[PDB]
Amino acid sequence: MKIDILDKGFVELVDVMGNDLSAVRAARVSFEERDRHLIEYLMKHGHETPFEHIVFTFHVKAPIFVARQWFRHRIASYNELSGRFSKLSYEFYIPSPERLEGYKTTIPPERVTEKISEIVDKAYRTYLELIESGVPREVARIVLPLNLYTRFFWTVNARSLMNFLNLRADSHAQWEIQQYALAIARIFKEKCPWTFEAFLKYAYKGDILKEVQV
Amino acid sequence: HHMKIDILDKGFVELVDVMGNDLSAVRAARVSEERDRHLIEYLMKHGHETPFEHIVFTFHVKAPIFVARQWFRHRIASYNELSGRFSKLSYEFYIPSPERLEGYKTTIPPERVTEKISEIVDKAYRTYLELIESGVPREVARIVLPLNLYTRFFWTVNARSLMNFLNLRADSHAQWEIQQYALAIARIFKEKCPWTFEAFLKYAYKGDILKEV
Amino acid sequence: MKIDILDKGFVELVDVMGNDLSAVRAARVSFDEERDRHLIEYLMKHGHETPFEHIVFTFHVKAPIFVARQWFRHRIASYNELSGRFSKLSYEFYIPSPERLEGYKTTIPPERVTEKISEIVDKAYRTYLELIESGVPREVARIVLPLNLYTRFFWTVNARSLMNFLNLRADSHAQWEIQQYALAIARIFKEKCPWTFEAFLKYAYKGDILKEVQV
Amino acid sequence: HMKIDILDKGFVELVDVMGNDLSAVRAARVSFDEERDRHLIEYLMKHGHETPFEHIVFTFHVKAPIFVARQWFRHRIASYNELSGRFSKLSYEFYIPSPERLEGYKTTIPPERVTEKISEIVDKAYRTYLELIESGVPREVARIVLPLNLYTRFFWTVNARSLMNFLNLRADSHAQWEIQQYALAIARIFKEKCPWTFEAFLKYAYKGDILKEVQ
Lengths: 214, 213, 215, 215
Ligand SMILES: Cc1cc2nc3c(=O)[nH]c(=O)nc-3n(C[C@H](O)[C@H](O)[C@H](O)COP(=O)(O)OP(=O)(O)OC[C@H]3O[C@@H](n4cnc5c(N)ncnc54)[C@H](O)[C@@H]3O)c2cc1C
Ligand SMILES: Cc1cc2nc3c(=O)[nH]c(=O)nc-3n(C[C@H](O)[C@H](O)[C@H](O)COP(=O)(O)OP(=O)(O)OC[C@H]3O[C@@H](n4cnc5c(N)ncnc54)[C@H](O)[C@@H]3O)c2cc1C
Ligand SMILES: Cc1cc2nc3c(=O)[nH]c(=O)nc-3n(C[C@H](O)[C@H](O)[C@H](O)COP(=O)(O)OP(=O)(O)OC[C@H]3O[C@@H](n4cnc5c(N)ncnc54)[C@H](O)[C@@H]3O)c2cc1C
Ligand SMILES: Cc1cc2nc3c(=O)[nH]c(=O)nc-3n(C[C@H](O)[C@H](O)[C@H](O)COP(=O)(O)OP(=O)(O)OC[C@H]3O[C@@H](n4cnc5c(N)ncnc54)[C@H](O)[C@@H]3O)c2cc1C
Fold this sequence. Notes:
The structure is a homotetramer. By secondary structure, the first copy, chain A, is α+β, with helices and mostly antiparallel strands.
């Protein structure tokens, strides 16, 4: 399972422990219609702890400004590329003109896209000039813009994942992280369809997952 | 099939599920064999612990409440236990065997201690039944039950928190009863993550009993 | 601040870091009354919970072990409890009063239930003393003590986790015994953070008893 | 007012503190003599009894470059409130490494030219950003062109146990020089408020190097 996001980003499923029945087993402390009914009962009454026994590992490629928002979710495990020592692809998120639709801009949205590519090209060339002259990466990389792509592994249980979808798969969140949250919701739906449907029905406080088919 | 280890007279540690193995920590450390095992020893030696959070276990444990209270102090984990208010219980209790009192100079034989423990457990359980039969709700009636009453719980924990649990509980300073439970956790962990377990015993394990037993 | 709970229990305030303005400062990332109170209500109303993590409390609680086990399930907090292996204990037990069984149709009078609970507690405690006198270590001998034995612990918790605790424990679905302790926690919280507590009751509180019982 | 300047425009400022060394002593004993209290702090540190130190809490206000704040926010056992890149007003200040930061590195151009080239690209990125804002582009999109050395501000609420884990990892020569400077300031404030815990930490638990080399 791999879903492309933005111009060069992605959300990829690395591993998963369990499925809907893992929450049923934990709720009953015991190793179809009755099991699905139990998932809905747990969700309808705020019994969230059984859902902590379903765990996912994702491999995400996202711009640093999106990764900073994501890393605010503390109840999860992260391993990211080192800005000091890792090899980077040096790819950057260049918003398409349609990203500025709805905004009354003084210049055409095409010019915004061009100006963004222009400054990232200059910052990247300056960075290369510093590396070529012997400056270590940990110092030279500080000139790189916030739209630089990074990669990380994210291990998260279904309860914390559902909190993430409540907050990020919502119109109040930045459009870029909304797109990533839609991909997380899609993989979550594929692996835990009963929990996902129950979540949308009773616990989900956001808006876009009840408007967009994932 | 899955690992199951019996502990004490009626307890057990059972493996329900596991996500990953040693290579899950290697994949997370690289964000992407002698070289893979060498990377595990390197992460362990230099204290790079976060990759080990990408290996997760789910156990089903049956333990006396006094042991479970010690276990539930490990907050970086997920728990689901039988409800003392609403769950049906087996009403089993941990009766220490006479050998548990070896080394202690007791005025009565250790066999009599075992008998006195079974005796008070029987009286508390019969009093409890008398209260339930007369309409007292379980959430009130169960408060007379002794601390050696067996409970059951699911424990979902990553390898990093599990290794912290072994440092603290698989050690002679911890109570003998929880040491037995920690040996079973260490055993299942070794079976699923042999490279991480060996690296842990070699460079990070602070206790004593895992290097003796 | 000390509030008695049950027959021998208590909730006592040991220390507190901050007040309502600590959440205001954190929300604005900056070190008047109506504007500050309006901000507390805005953050509460829209689910901006992280600012409330910058208000912290330390309580000293004396509660029966069955109550303490429910409390220790709240992992986003710090605990230090008396050791069952090595601490000196008071050997006090929670004996429910007859009024605790009101509403239940019992075969025997509620007074007899209270008596039977004191009776088995006394026998378990005497058996425990007989084991200690004969050389059995406390870590083994104490396993015969009932779940209503009182323990003591220090609880350090931030206002966000404390509000989650009130949502779950200051509610009629929770056991009556932990509800009484949650009312005392809500009371001390109200005294120290009156704006946050009022905003909490108005917009984020999911329970029922804090909107029924005067605190 | 404890405030320590870090780098060219950064700082670590103490906002509030709950407790001191005696807060860990009270939690260890579960109870609400100088030599005996200091001896207990050393005993807890020596034998790895860490939970009592969770009852001492600090709140800091930090101004650090985003590349440093990202390293700091990896410490999950803490509370954070940062300026919003989408909606907050910013000072638009950037960390320009001084020539001495490149000492020890054999560079093809003088270290002064590296500093100049960094200021140069920072100025161009900032001017491009202003051109986008002036033309109606929202800040959440326009700001993505700003470099990683842009200063941000955040409130950090952390207990002494997590703070000591942070010092173990960041107040060490293996960590990036920039975050070590911030960790030294955190250690100084910690030492001022909890001198017994800090000394005990340095004697028995600290695994880094620089806090045993720098006073
Ligand atoms: C639209 C939007 C705007 C935002 N704007 C800002 C902003 O301007 N500035 C900013 O700093 N942040 C901002 N955030 C980030 C936000 O404050 C949270 O950090 C983020 O959403 C993670 O939420 P969380 O704490 O619930 O998640 P996690 O950290 O994963 O926590 C999950 C749950 O665990 C519990 N929890 C975890 N740790 C603690 C703790 N230490 N204390 C108490 N309970 C805890 C809580 O119940 C929490 O819901 C914004 C988020 C969104 C969605
Ligand atoms: C021999 C022995 C005797 C003990 N005696 C007592 C006793 O008398 N009284 C008593 O109350 N307890 C006692 N304990 C329990 C002990 O204090 C811990 O509560 C328990 O071992 C869990 O340890 P932990 O905090 O490392 O684990 P977890 O709670 O799982 O935490 C794991 C790790 O996460 C971090 N952590 C998690 N939450 C926080 C937080 N809020 N702040 C900072 N860091 C955090 C720390 O790095 C910690 O090591 C005893 C334990 C042992 C082994
Ligand atoms: C009426 C009632 C009945 C209950 N019955 C039972 C029962 O029968 N059996 C039983 O075992 N328990 C039972 N519980 C306990 C319950 O499951 C919780 O353990 C307890 O209420 C603590 O809530 P919490 O997990 O939100 O609190 P905390 O553990 O303090 O967590 C606070 C917040 O942090 C987050 N969180 C913390 N750790 C994690 C994690 N590892 N993964 C994801 N998110 C995390 C969540 O957002 C959570 O809301 C009962 C509770 C109530 C109120
Ligand atoms: C020199 C150096 C280089 C680094 N390089 C990289 C890098 O290349 N890439 C990268 O991604 N990170 C890197 N890191 C960051 C590192 O992996 C940690 O994220 C960071 O040090 C935070 O430490 P912590 O996890 O112990 O802290 P916290 O998250 O504050 O945790 C405190 C303690 O709580 C416990 N804990 C908290 N949450 C959990 C959990 N979910 N499961 C288990 N235990 C838990 C642990 O005992 C931990 O020590 C680097 C750090 C250093 C110092």
